[PDB]
Amino acid sequence: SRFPEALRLALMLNDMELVEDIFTSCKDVVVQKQMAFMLGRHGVFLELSEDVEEYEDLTEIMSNVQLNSNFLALARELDIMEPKVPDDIYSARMNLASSFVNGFVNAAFGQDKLLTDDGNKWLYKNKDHGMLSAAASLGMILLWDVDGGLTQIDKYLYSSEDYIKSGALLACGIVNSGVRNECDPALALLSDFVLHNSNTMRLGSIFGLGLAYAGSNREDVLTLLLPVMGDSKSSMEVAGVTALACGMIAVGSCNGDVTSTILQTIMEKSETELKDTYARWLPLGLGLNHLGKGEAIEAILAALEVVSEPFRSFANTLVDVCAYAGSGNVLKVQQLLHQGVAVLGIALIAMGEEIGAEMALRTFGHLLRYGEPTLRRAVPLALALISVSNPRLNILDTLSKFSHDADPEVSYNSIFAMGMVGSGTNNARLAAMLRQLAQYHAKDPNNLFMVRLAQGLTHLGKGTLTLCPYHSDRQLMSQVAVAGLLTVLVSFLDVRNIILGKSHYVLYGLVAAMQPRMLVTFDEELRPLPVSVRVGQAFQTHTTPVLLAHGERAELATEEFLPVTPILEGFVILRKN
């Protein structure tokens, strides 16, 4: 009798019929509470009949309602509640940089010195889209605080300035990510603007709804959104954003209506319009819809046969490598060894097992040194994907070397990749490198912008957050984290026009992957119960709550308590002798 083991295996299989059949027929309540914590961490919400023994509490756990309070409690143990302004870490371009830095560092602590009681003083120092992303950063600071988040955002939903209102809509979506609040306040607030006359409003509302509902393929939210790709007033940017939102909401579900609607939107577009790089967001949403489903993808590869030849290579490659993202398939990697999405797909497939990942690391170094001049632009982003929140020294040395490339896009992507690799770690080596590289790229606005983003990303959450997609002994992959990471890195395969252009708000897709990296233990009543742990790697002695790093294993120091789950990661319930 070890239902948390069976449940972990079922989650590995992604076979929700068996997950639901194992969660039921467990008679022990506290075991179900532990399994509910596991499901909440994995982003699976299962509907229960109100006549199950403890429906109220199992539902309350599964929806991460208490996540914010435990996170702030650990923030009180560390004495880190004080806000940091961006200059502590150290034109429109630099105010935009400061806004993103401020949001990244103060993420999940609802405090700030820029977005004060009155945020207009900061918002109106920005212009156009930078003001949209500034307004969106407020919702990133208030992450997982739905009630307080909306209470703070609400004043800006009535702004006369459309960019500020669009950013407030996106923020309102962001604060609802991961917290599955049983009120659907985001759907009520955002759903009137998905067909608004202003396209900027449509972008804010649709990206917000996509982030708020990324976990589950809600039929109502999908029925609301799917019409917007066919609207004659929708820009290609709006069609792309709609495909991203629908694929995030429907991630891994094989939803047929998303598939058919996207294929129709491809088949309608001119061979002249499919050159627009927002069109790359159309098949990304398609791949997200079939992420990890493997050999089933052939049925759709045949339907793409009619599409124009230049676009066809990209769509086919991206959708195919999405279908195999977790496989760690030796033969697809041989096939991949258009080119950018190929190398990104190599990383996306290889990250599932370590030997393939080391061979990928060798390949990526070879490509950065001697590869095709066009092909190497994507090579550092693949290094990000395979090693997010994992500050290896060899990877950082390689990226630091190529952060001076005379090709501007190799430089941009290497700096962003350093920020991704070091994200959520206060790594002093990386911080010093970034400071020196900031002194080198002074008088270079785009490289300096990438430097500020990487600096902010290193201090994400003041060191308390991670972006790694894996959890629970590095054996379960969060699909919503993968969807957010892929959204960002595929948008970085055209950094000069998407990220350095108008659409840098897509950086907020990283919020889908943000998770806490703290171990916390409870008694059987969910009351903070301090115990002592021996955190090694597989060592010092620590008292829970303890922050774990990327590859560390905690084991209870004494035999007084016994854990209900064999893995001491995240939230663990502890029984008595």
Binding site: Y158, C183, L187, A188, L189, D192, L224
Partner: peptide, 18 residues
């Protein structure tokens, strides 16, 4: 309206506030 409140049915026009 799929975007309204009646509080919140178990505990108004959000956009217009009418």
């Amino acid at each position: 309206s799929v975007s309204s409140a009646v509080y919140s049915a178990s505990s108004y026009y959000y956009s217009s506030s009418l």
